[PDB]
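Cross-posted from the bioinformatics board.
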Amino acid sequence: RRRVVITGMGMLSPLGLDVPSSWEGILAGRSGIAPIEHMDLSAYSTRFGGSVKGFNVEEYLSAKEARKLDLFIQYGLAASFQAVRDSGLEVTDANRERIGVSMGSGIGGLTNIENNCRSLFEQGPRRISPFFVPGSIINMVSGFLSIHLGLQGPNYALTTAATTGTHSIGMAARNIAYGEADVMVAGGSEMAACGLGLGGFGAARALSTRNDEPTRASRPWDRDRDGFVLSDGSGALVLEELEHARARGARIYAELVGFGMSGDAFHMTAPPEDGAGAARCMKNALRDAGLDPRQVDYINAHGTSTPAGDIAEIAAVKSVFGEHAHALSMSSTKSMTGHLLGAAGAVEAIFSVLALRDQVAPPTINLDNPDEGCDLDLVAHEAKPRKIDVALSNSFGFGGTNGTLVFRRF
Amino acid sequence: RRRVVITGMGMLSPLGLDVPSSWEGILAGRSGIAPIEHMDLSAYSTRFGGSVKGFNVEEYLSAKEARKLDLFIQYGLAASFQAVRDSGLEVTDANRERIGVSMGSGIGGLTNIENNCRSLFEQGPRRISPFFVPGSIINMVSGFLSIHLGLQGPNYALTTAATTGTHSIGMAARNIAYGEADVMVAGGSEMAACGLGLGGFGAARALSTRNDEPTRASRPWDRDRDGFVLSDGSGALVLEELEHARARGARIYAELVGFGMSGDAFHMTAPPEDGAGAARCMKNALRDAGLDPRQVDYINAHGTSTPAGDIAEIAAVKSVFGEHAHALSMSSTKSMTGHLLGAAGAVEAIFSVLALRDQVAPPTINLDNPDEGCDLDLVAHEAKPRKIDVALSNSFGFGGTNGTLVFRRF
Ligand SMILES: CC(C)NC(=O)c1c[nH]cn1
Ligand SMILES: CC(C)NC(=O)c1c[nH]cn1
């Protein structure tokens, strides 16, 4: 099996329109959460979230192309173009069959579906856009990116709720490991802040309702946590076979050494209280990496600010790491970004890689009063400079679908 | 790399509520296409399609469980339960971590989204169902199946338009080949026959409008073809490591020996006229299988009854197979079933496996007048008994995403 390295990264997040502006936000403990402005929410119990601010799609696409694509596709293409540009890779006839794409989404084109539904109900089916299907389906980030850059390798899309970006990157790494591709662009994108999204998650009572202090709503492992904060954005990595990267003198950020998966097989939305499924997933990833739990320095947690999930993840970390659980640093960047759903795994993989580059554990902001049993190093309030050789990134999604990525300094 | 065999199959299709009723339909050249009855379509240009007739979800689930799930999830669970029952596999503490699920969909819960949109527009966000998100997202077939049967292995969902079921089965086979699972339940499901689906595909001019003769609308490679016929249903296979299957004395249908992928990188909806991407995909699959093109006996074609796609697939088959292109049999079962979108690859994998079991090439019905260059053995009109050692199944999806599965008699 061939070694896989990260040579390019791209992001849109509530903290910035690229990787270095987002990361500056993360290390400063800045919140990206604000009252929502692009719709009127005075009939909703949650009226805030993490928006991408100032996004200009015409930096990436013609206005003609963009008007045919849902926002989640625009955001995925933006992160993907940034990553490819960041990688310095040149696509030619000699390599285009060896370069593929795995960009996923958890919900896809909800906004577009909602707008076409309005036309359909008010004015009948003839008012539906001809670009409705190709501009709304989840695999059109992979499809459009492949067309725009001439990428002829494996071309597909995962949809595994909050685990989407983690699965997208892990399965892309497998394609390269197994020799199906030399390069993959992988990650995820989400834009679910329409009436159906806020209404949907709200009707499930899944969202924080702290409308008086939105920057304080996302508070992973805090005793006053009350549900996640809905956020938008995208993350993409360029994954490359190590000898291919060396040959062309690429800048290498990190090595992607392990990927694990499991299912809880317990409940559609609630994890088991002991986090047995998350424990299996992290062990599977470390076994895939050929690493002992004692070699892990940093975990970028799932940590969504829900009552049951946050404490299940602590339990799983204590089960897997034993005494070393008190030596590693674990934080949730969702404290600042909120929950980017299908993009959360992609942006958190990027933060895990940059934690390795900069030798700094990003903070869990808003962790004022850690709940019963939440006595690990959760990097409360402030970024902590420390030795990081190995970083883990966890994603635990609806349906009990789990994924873990393991990254190493190269 | 470990060998992968098929030990269980399940289906809902326009031709039957299980595999043997569907397959009897296929070998008799029966159409599953009829005028649509469950909605009023006198403002639509297409008023027919392939419905699942007489489906009773209470054969599989409680009425309480079912009311919370979109039809595409009900259909996926039905096919999955059939496959698992057909396999005779017993799930225990000793094996549950080694059994996973990859059931995908191309569009997912369009009907549910449409119904919740109506509530939202008429009566505001408080009218949205609390089960809207978990009952509509694509990965809830994998999630619910894992919960219902206690499956704790890899748990994920592909969404690659018409290639979904092919990718789902190929990537599940990779999980077993690489040792991540001993058993996977894989395939796809679709229910897109709501206003948004018929309206959507109609607005793109993608559908046949032959409302006067619906059973004759789906006519792959015929000079009078005018777009695909929209169909609903699901397909699931139980994939198993060969020594695991032998150990428990499973009945083995076939061996899954190859899987290939490519991207066209050409156009969002139209293939290149020479089918270069489909050619790469079929070569990748045969190279993955360790088979020469001359060993292929039967191809279950993508063959959707569109002007450009049907002839691109002939071109690709002539490029890959050369003189042997005139010795193999190729047919489109979509002539009878119509286009099941994200389930098409799953039901066509099943038909390819049963072509190996029964030594019979299913027919392309309605192939009255083959178009220019469509001079291969397309098994026009009637099933053809013949020697089949090796069968290929092709899927070519929106975004130029391609997949091919290669099956062998075991
Ligand atoms: C979404 C939920 C099932 N996931 C979690 O937050 C979690 C934590 N440990 C295990 N699952
Ligand atoms: C959907 C379309 C792009 N696919 C085809 O029908 C086809 C046939 N050969 C190559 N693609």
